[PDB]
């Protein structure tokens, strides 16, 4: 048993002592050298560490292959098992697979950190169907996340595997030849022959045994019945790592034939216990195509439930009886085995029962009736009879990879031939805490007609008997409690249908349709490049990303990528529990006890000084009290990250309360503020309102959200023993503060440190600064101890600490004209900051400045105010505050389109700044292009035909609705603050004449160093195979900005561009001696000329200054401008919605390059779209967040995007203000993602004409995010009636 | 630096130039990425050619910084250097030499 | 230089020299070489990318 043999990519790995918590993932990077495969969550949700197996089936008596999370995936599983990661099928130094050529050259790469793990899964796809169809590519990522992308690129890049200027060549694309790839290990394939037997590996902790027979296990069961089994390890994997549960002896019976086996059976179809959901979904499948639809209903149902569980790498190791065992509150299929009476088969040594799940199956919460010596054998899902229909729903946050707010299973059984109800089981997940069935509610209705009385008995009986208090976990009462109605009058209409044959009422027909994607459409429009220019010159040309090949190839190094030193530590962050409290203790008694423990690291550590932050608000490490959950105490450091993490789980903090402020509104009500109020007034506001026709006002809020980079804070800190120098690897936007605040902490001259920058995977803001707290930390540690030290977040660890978006909360009025012209307006704005300052009141003005969006508004007068509270320090996040901003200003608008009674693009095109106008802070708009991407937006979108489509869908459709928004912005181009606008660049020509150049910027995934690249390549006429970009360091490049504001194009851009001006300047006279030679020539002339070949660049934005006080002089250099048109189709029963179409105009000047510029807009946009439609935090009332990952943080999907998406750059617009006539663009577009909410208020607004209202001038609040909660519960119906807030005496009047 | 003293050479021209002690100057190491091309540290002249480099690269320093010595006559070298920080004075320059 | 801490996957490299003044290589033999516990590899002119 002893050995555990596998093979990974063709090498055959013989692990002699393999511990039974050691995961794939851990043992690719730590153990193999294999850094391709990444860590982003480490809980199933990003798809990150997707890798390929492949093993006999003796049993299909084939090669199988599937796809599967590295991170979840023990390797005691893998006995046997061939696995091929990113870097088993191609790379840069051989040739790339075709899958990961597409990726980089159809522009499906950013960042890349998400790369290596969507090639696995579109490779995967490939070796089971070479010519798949483009559902089964879409189908092929429900378990991968892209946070940079907006996924358009790598969709469309991959379909060319299905069946203007271009942003890519498919006819340049390699073809997939299936004889060349990797063949199944030869040896492996000898193996299949030996019968296989029971092997046990043991580890620090705990001891696996993998039986070999059913004998075996239950033998096994009955010696240790406290022994956990394991299969897919995709619950156990959690419990383990995220609810510090240990099982110190695991069986795994995944081997065993009886677990395997699928029958098909007079009464059913029965799969064994271990069969993964993914053979049950193909088994089901062929069986519902096979079958009579009468036959085939609980396998619709199952398979329904499937299509949104998980995703293809969950779907593929996850078996049936560990969901059905594990008995999860929010299991989809356990609702439906009780519905349906599915049959479970459970046997011990000398025992078998056969039982139908039903109510009793499951007492208490996670308990089932199977005893300590019994397994789950098999389980039969039943045919339907004649007279029997089923349903299945569930709704989530998000509908792909999703865990369910409310799910269930549906069965009625009618007499032979009628209406009249013999059986009825209505089974829900997430109304308790286990699977229930309402039997009170059916036991009613037997013998009872399916009609109208029947309809309104049911849902009377559910509001009723499945009540939630307003203490419930999860919250969103009324919201479930709607669900649970909404999902019976789905059923309820499906059965009717169902029964009379197969016109029965439309209007009501499509409230019974399955979900249905339409084939996706993308266009993408942009400019070619003048005839004339020359092939070596790429500015304007859509050039991949310099480094995308290689983060397809898995070969990018990405932070924690770099090998470790054999004497490298690893360092754990201690944080607080508690949201406000004195420190009384710390005890590390425990923690001393953890095996290769090294220090506990606190503030009396550090040798220099504890004060940090941007505004030196901040402690390194907490002292004397905790400010917020997430507060940084103290870091274990430990041998390995395993050793860290369980030492510091087991640091005992003793604390005593002080009374906490956590929301803005506590903090309003305690004076609890960072400095003084904010304010733009111009004009006069009291002559405005009287002047007004109307005056609306209200109150409006906005969610935060959490950057979600796919790779997260991540520092490796060298100290070298020598004067205090540290040299640190960082994934960071801000080299310079990084620098800076480890020498303030070690108490060394900034010149000692040394900061390097290769790449972010991805930093939104995040990494602008919020990035030195785990900086400083693992500098802390390598100070202290004189090792190099590392530490990577956790994704939880990051969630929690390291900040997010600012919620915003605006109480505002404004006074308009009948016409709809605005006359007058006030808003307030207040911005949760949490427990430091940081940038929050760069990020307030910023929100300030962008209060008008693209509206002439005369009287105005703007305030904001910074609320202290004990939160995590919120930060930079995409935007900077215009977002919030943008979105009160959109808010109010469109009340004011309502108010009036006119169409929305009326209101807004009539309110519209015209060429010269001045901003509400003096800026003139010079040349303000929003008119023109108005217009041509309206036309390529064919608004107005759409428009009146639109009506029509609304005047048919009774429980859905589409909406449409078409909404402009202005984005200010320039860090606010004057001293930032400062950039500089350093450039060497080697004799060769091959150039390096470097400048302040870092690469986080938008192409900034590609840019820089074809910049020098323009300017110094040589193509840019002749010139490279490494790095971002403090020593090449010395106090540089972060890499922010989207200015980072134009000002490195411009300090690389007058470097090479210099270069050309010594050049000259050797290219006058020598007209004909080559750059190399000249080159070498002047080196043995004695000419230096390198010099600085230096750029400064001139002519910025804004005064608040004098309320003047330009707060930006210019502005960004685009316009977007949405429509969505609501579910007004559920409160998904589908985004159908989306056209966005952007102007970006002449683009530098424009596939770079187009992945800019969907990825902003599909940033802001999360933000507004999908993505919410939520915290319990004493400040602790609850959404820490994927499975509860919902980003946008491969599946959330609008089905046609088409991006147009604005022709012939140069922008005279920045380098070669280009404009900034990483952040202007994201609150284009408004247009989708806004779309859906329009639907909203539709449903509430259809089920609540004849008043057509009503205003209802919508906040953000417009969660499928709030759509829902603003359709207002004779639903939401019946299970509303929280019979009486008593009753006044 | 093989132990001739190179680096503290010129540690100690720079700090003559720039009229600061040598304690705020650090050499750390040499580096093809810093200064590219360089003849190898030989024929006993890297004194007298790369002093005359540091010596050029801290008269460009002391020509931007001088503004802000001129508007602020008694204040620290450290004051002069985040005035012309914050003036978004560039602080990085190049220096060369030739026999 | 050798102070610097090595890397955990850092290997270590040993010249194979010539023990004549001028003569012809007519082969080498690495076998007994690839004996010696923790053998990785024999480099020689062949393995030259440039
Ligand atoms: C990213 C992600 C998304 C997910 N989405 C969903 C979803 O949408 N809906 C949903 O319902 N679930 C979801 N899950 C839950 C999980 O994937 C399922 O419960 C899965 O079926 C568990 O199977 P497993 O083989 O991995 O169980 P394991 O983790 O291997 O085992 C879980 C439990 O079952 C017991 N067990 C396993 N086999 C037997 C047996 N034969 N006899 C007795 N006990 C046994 C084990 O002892 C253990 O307690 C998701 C999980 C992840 C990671
Ligand atoms: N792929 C990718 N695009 C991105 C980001 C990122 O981290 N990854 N950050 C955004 C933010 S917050 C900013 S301010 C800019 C920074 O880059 P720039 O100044 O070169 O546009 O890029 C934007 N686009
Ligand atoms: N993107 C992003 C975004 C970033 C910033 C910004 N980043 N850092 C700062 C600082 C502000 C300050 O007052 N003091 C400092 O030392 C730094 N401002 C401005 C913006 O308009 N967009
Ligand atoms: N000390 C020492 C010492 C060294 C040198 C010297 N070093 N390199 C060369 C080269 C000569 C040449 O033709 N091509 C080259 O690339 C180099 N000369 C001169 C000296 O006077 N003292
Ligand atoms: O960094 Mo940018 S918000
Ligand atoms: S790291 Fe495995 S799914 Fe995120
Ligand atoms: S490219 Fe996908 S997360 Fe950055
Ligand atoms: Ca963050
Ligand atoms: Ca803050």
Redesign the interface.
Same mark, same amino acid.
């Given at each position: 048993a002893d050995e555990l043999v596998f093979f990974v990519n063709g090498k055959k790995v013989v692990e002699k002592n393999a511990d039974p918590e050691t995961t794939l993932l851990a043992y690719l990077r730590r153990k193999l /050298?294999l850094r391709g495969t990444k860590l982003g969550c480490g809980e199933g949700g990003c798809g990150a560490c997707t890798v390929m197996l492949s093993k006999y089936d003796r049993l299909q008596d084939k090669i199988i292959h599937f796809s599967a999370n590295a991170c979840l995936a023990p390797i005691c599983t893998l006995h046997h098992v061939a696995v091929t990661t990113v870097e088993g099928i191609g790379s840069t130094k051989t040739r790339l697979h075709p899958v990961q050529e597409r990726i980089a050259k159809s522009h499906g790469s950013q960042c890349g950190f998400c790369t290596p793990g969507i090639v696995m899964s579109m490779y995967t796809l490939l070796r089971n169907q070479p010519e798949p169809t483009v559902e089964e590519i879409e189908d092929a990522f429900q378990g991968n996340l892209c946070r940079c992308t907006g996924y358009r690129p790598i969709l469309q890049g991959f379909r060319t595997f299905a069946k203007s200027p271009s942003l890519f060549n498919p006819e340049e694309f390699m073809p997939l030849d299936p004889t060349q790839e990797p063949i199944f290990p030869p040896e492996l394939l000898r193996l299949k022959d030996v019968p296989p037997k029971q092997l046990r590996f043991e580890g620090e902790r705990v001891t696996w045994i993998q039986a070999s027979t059913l004998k075996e296990l239950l033998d096994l069961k009955a010696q240790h019945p406290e022994a956990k089994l394991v299969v897919g390890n995709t619950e156990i994997g959690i419990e383990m790592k995220f609810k510090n549960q240990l099982f110190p002896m695991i069986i795994c019976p995944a081997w065993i034939p009886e677990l395997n086996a699928v029958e098909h059976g007079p009464e059913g179809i029965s799969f064994g216990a271990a069969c993964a959901l993914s053979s049950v979904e193909k088994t089901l499948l062929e069986a519902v195509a096979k079958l009579p639809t009468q036959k085939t209903e609980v396998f619709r149902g199952v398979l329904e439930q499937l299509r949104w569980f998980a995703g293809k790498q969950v779907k593929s190791v996850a078996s049936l009886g560990g969901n059905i065992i594990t008995a999860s509150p929010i299991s989809d299929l356990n609702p439906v085995f009780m519905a349906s009476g599915t049959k479970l088969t459970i046997v011990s040594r000398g025992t078998r029962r056969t039982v139908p799940m039903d109510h009793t199956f499951f007492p208490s919460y996670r308990k089932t009736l199977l005893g300590p010596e019994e397994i789950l054998l098999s389980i039969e899902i039943p045919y339907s009879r004649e007279d029997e229909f089923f349903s299945a729903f569930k709704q989530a946050s998000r509908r792909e990879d999703d865990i369910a707010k409310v799910t269930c299973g549906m069965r009625v059984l009618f007499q032979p031939g009628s209406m009249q109800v013999k059986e009825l089981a209505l089974c829900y997940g997430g109304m308790a805490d286990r699977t229930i069935s309402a039997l009170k509610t059916t036991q009613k209705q037997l013998s009872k007609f399916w009609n109208e009385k029947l309809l309104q008995d049911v849902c009377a009986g559910l509001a009723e008997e499945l009540s939630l208090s307003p203490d419930a976990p999860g919250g969103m009462i009324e919201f479930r409690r709607t669900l649970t109605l909404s999902f019976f009058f789905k059923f309820y209409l499906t059965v009717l249908k169902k029964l009379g044959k197969d016109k029965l009422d439309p209007t009501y027909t499509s409230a019974t349709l399955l979900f249905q994607k339409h084939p996706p459409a993308n266009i993408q429009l942009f400019q070619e490049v003048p005839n004339g220019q020359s092939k070596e010159d790429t500015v304007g040309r859509p050039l991949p990303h310099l480094a995308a090949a290689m983060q397809a190839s898995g070969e990018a190094v990405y932070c924690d990528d770099i =090998? @470790?030193? !054999?004497? !490298?530590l690893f360092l754990r962050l201690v944080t607080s529990t508690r949201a406000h409290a004195k420190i009384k203790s710390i005890d590390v008694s425990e923690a001393q006890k953890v095996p290769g423990f090294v220090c506990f690291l606190s503030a009396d550590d550090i040798p220099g000084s504890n004060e940090t932050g941007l505004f030196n608000d901040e402690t390194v490490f907490a002292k004397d009290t905790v400010t917020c959950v997430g507060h940084i105490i103290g870091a274990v450091v430990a041998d390995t990250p395993e050793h860290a993490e369980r030492a510091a789980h087991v640091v005992k903090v003793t604390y005593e309360d002080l009374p906490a402020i956590i929301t803005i509104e506590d903090a309003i009500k305690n004076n609890s503020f960072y400095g003084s109020e904010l304010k733009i007034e111009k004009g006069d506001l009291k002559k405005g309102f009287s002047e007004a026709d109307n005056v609306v006002s209200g109150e409006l809020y906005i969610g935060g959200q959490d950057h979600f980079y796919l790779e997260t804070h991540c520092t490796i800190a060298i100290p070298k023993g020598e004067?205090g120098?540290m040299e640190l690897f960082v994934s960071t936007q801000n080299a310079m503060k990084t620098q800076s605040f480890v020498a303030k902490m070690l108490g060394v =001259?900034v010149?000692?440190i040394?900061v390097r920058v290769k790449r972010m995977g991805g930093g939104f803001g995040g990494k602008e600064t919020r990035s030195t707290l785990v900086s400083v930390a693992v500098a802390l540690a390598a100070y202290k101890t004189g090792h190099?030290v590392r530490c990577m977040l956790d994704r939880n660890e990051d969630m929690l600490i390291t900040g997010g978006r600012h919620p915003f909360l605006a109480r505002y009025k404004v006074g308009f004209m009948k016409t709809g012209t605005i006359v007058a307006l006030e808003v307030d704005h207040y911005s949760n900051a949490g427990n430091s300052r940081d940038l929050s009141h760069s990020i307030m003005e910023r929100a300030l400045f962008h209060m008008d969006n693209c509206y002439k508004i005369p009287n105005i007068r703007g305030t904001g105010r910074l609320c202290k509270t004990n939160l995590s320090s919120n930060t930079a996040f995409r935007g900077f505050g215009g977002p919030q901003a943008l979105f009160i200003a959109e808010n109010w608008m469109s009340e004011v389109a309502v108010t009036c009674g006119l169409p929305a693009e009326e209101v807004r095109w009539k309110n519209m700044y015209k060429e010269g106008d001045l901003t509400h802070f003096n800026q003139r708009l010079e040349g303000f292009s929003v008119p023109r991407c108005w217009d041509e937006c309206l036309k390529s979108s064919q608004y107005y035909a759409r428009k009146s489509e639109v009506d029509k869908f609304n005047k048919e459709n009774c429980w859905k609705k589409r909406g449409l928004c078409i909404i402009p912005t202005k984005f200010g181009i320039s860090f606010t603050v =004057? #001293?930032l606008?400062?950039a /500089?660049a350093?450039i060497?020509?080697? &004799?060769d004449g091959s150039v390096?150049v *470097?400048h302040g910027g870092t690469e986080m995934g938008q192409g900034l160093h590609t840019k820089m690249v074809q910049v020098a390549s323009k300017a110094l006429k040589i193509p840019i195979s002749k010139i490279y970009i *490494?790095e971002t360091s403090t020593? &090449?490049? =010395?106090?540089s900005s972060p890499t922010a504001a989207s200015v980072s194009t134009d000002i490195y851009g411009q300090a690389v561009y007058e470097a090479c001006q210099t270069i050309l300047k010594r050049l000259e006279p050797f290219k006058k001696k020598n007209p004909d030679g080559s750059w190399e020539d000249w080159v070498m002339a002047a080196?043995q000329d @004695?000419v *230096?070949?390198? &010099? &600085?660049g #230096?750029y400064?934005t001139p002519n910025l200054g804004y005064s608040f006080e004098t309320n003047s002089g330009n707060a930006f250099h210019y502005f960004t401008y685009g316009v977007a048109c949405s429509e969505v189709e609501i579910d007004c029963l559920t409160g998904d919605h589908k985004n159908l179409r989306t056209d966005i105009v952007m102007d970006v000047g002449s683009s530098l390059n424009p596939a770079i510029d187009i992945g800019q807009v969907e990825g902003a946009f599909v940033q802001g779209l999360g933000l507004f439609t999908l993505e919410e935090l939520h915290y319990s009332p004493e400040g602790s967040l609850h959404t820490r990952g994927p499975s509860t943080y919902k980003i946008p999907a491969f599946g959330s995007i609008p089905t046609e998406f088409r991006v147009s750059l604005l022709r012939d617009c140069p922008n005279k203000k920045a380098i070669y006539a280009s404009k900034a663009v990483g952040e202007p577009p994201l609150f284009l993602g408004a247009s989708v909410f806004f779309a859906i208020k329009d639907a909203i607004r539709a449903a509430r004409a259809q089920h609540t209202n004849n008043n057509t001038k009503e205003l209802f609040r919508l906040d953000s995010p417009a969660t499928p909660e709030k759509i829902r519960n603003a359709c207002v119906d004779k639903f939401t009636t019946l299970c509303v807030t929280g019979k009486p005496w008593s009753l006044r009047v």
């Open positions: /050298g =090998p @470790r030193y !054999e004497n !490298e004067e120098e =001259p010149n000692r040394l190099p =004057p #001293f606008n400062q /500089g350093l060497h020509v080697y &004799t390096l *470097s *490494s020593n &090449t490049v =010395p106090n080196y @004695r *230096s070949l390198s &010099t &600085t #230096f400064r």
